[PDB]
Amino acid sequence: PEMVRGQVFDVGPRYTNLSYIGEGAYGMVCSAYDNLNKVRVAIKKISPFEHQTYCQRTLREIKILLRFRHENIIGINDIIRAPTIEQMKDVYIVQDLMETDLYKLLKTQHLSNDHICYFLYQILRGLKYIHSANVLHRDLKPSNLLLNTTCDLKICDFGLARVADPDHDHTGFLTEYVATRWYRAPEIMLNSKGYTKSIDIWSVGCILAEMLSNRPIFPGKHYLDQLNHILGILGSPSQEDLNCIINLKARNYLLSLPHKNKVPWNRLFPNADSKALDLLDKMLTFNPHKRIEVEQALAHPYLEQYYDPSDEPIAEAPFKFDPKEKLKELIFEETARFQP
Numbered sequence: 001p002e003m004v005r006g007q008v009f010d011v012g013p014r015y016t017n018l019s020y021i022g023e024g025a026y027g028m029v030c031s032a033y034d035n036l037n038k039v040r041v042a043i044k045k046i047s048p049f050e051h052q053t054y055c056q057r058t059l060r061e062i063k064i065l066l067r068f069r070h071e072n073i074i075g076i077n078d079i080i081r082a083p084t085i086e087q088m089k090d091v092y093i094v095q096d097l098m099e100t101d102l103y104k105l106l107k108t109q110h111l112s113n114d115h116i117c118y119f120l121y122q123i124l125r126g127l128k129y130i131h132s133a134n135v136l137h138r139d140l141k142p143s144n145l146l147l148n149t150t151c152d153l154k155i156c157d158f159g160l161a162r163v164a165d166p167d168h169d170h171t172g173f174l175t176e177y178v179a180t181r182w183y184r185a186p187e188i189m190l191n192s193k194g195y196t197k198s199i200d201i202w203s204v205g206c207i208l209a210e211m212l213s214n215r216p217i218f219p220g221k222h223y224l225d226q227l228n229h230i231l232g233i234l235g236s237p238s239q240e241d242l243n244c245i246i247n248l249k250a251r252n253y254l255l256s257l258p259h260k261n262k263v264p265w266n267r268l269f270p271n272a273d274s275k276a277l278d279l280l281d282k283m284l285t286f287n288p289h290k291r292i293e294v295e296q297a298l299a300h301p302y303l304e305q306y307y308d309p310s311d312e313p314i315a316e317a318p319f320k321f322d323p324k325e326k327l328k329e330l331i332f333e334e335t336a337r338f339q340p
């Protein structure tokens with residue numbers, strides 16, 4: 001087998017000429033030459049079977065992506081694993097090879113307004129399909145947004161995804177969470193489990209702001225710092241939005257803070273398109289029930305050059321609802337279609 005960085009990357013013989021690209025959750029990511037389709041591809045190695053949690057993350061991603069088909073969602077081309085459950089230690093996911101990701105792009109490249117507009121449209125177009133399947137991505141961030149050489153965008157990593165469950169979304173104050181800090185909606189710190197579609201819209205809002213200035217808009221330095229940054233820009237919540245927070249510990253925390261004024265978007269982003277800032281404001285709305293939804297965002301005047309509901313498809317079969325040995329067995333079963 002082809003050793004890579006002192007680790008087994010055993011994808012032969014179809015996939016050869018392997019170059020390191022990055023890291024997934026449970027293994028590295030490599031480029032490789034697909035000797036059948038005569039194209040270079042990306043391959044993610046996964047080693048999850050010793051842990052129930054890693055098996056869950058792997059299973060849900062495979063189950064979702066094997067049913068999803070959308071231009072702005074990177075699909076699974078192939079899955080490589082041993083022929084038997086006894087022998088399967090690793091799983092390799094083969095996907096399209098893209099040129100870069102938005103995280104890497106934002107470190108060095110200033111985006112034109114036309115690029116920001118096209119990138120945002122594709123994110124929302126992909127998100128519309130996802131949400132139409134009753135699925136939440138729940139970890140949208142620049143590093144999960146891939147771009148090819150012609151700036152086509154695809155959404156990656158559904159390992160943190162969940163089926164939407166808005167009736168069971170309420171929880172207590174400062175309860176644990178998994179998604180990436182800087183892209184976490186304020187209600188996550190206050191009273192939400194992240195089971196509603198609005199947590200994804202907040203992340204997209206954070207991404208739009210970051211495309212406008214090449215820096216994260218809410219760079220919280222630890223779990224507790226995140227809410228400081230959000231309120232530092234949005235200002236103090238209104239009485240109406242506080243009344244919507246019925247949990248007493250969360251509401252009383254917000255009531256204990258001194259007044260903060262809203263920072264105008266056009267002062268944070270003096271070069272930004274005014275229509276972009278209007279949409280930004282609607283995505284970064286404090287109250288999730290007032291936060292703009294994906295289909296409304298697509299119809300915003302900022303995206304008028306691209307908006308076409310007949311060219312923004314939705315899922316055929318939405319998802320109705322949601323030991324490691326049983327999970328390995330289900331991963332084996334779910335990947336069987338890619339064997340001879």
Ligand SMILES: C[C@H]1CCCC(=O)[C@@H](O)[C@@H](O)CCCOc2cc(O)cc(O)c2C(=O)O1
Nearest residue numbers: 022024042044096097098099100143156157
């Ligand atoms: C396999 C897929 C996993 C996506 C999810 C993921 O792990 C993230 O950490 C993301 O940051 C990927 C790092 C490198 O991911 C690529 C880089 C690149 O230059 C071209 C690509 O096609 C990919 C890719 O396909 O990533």
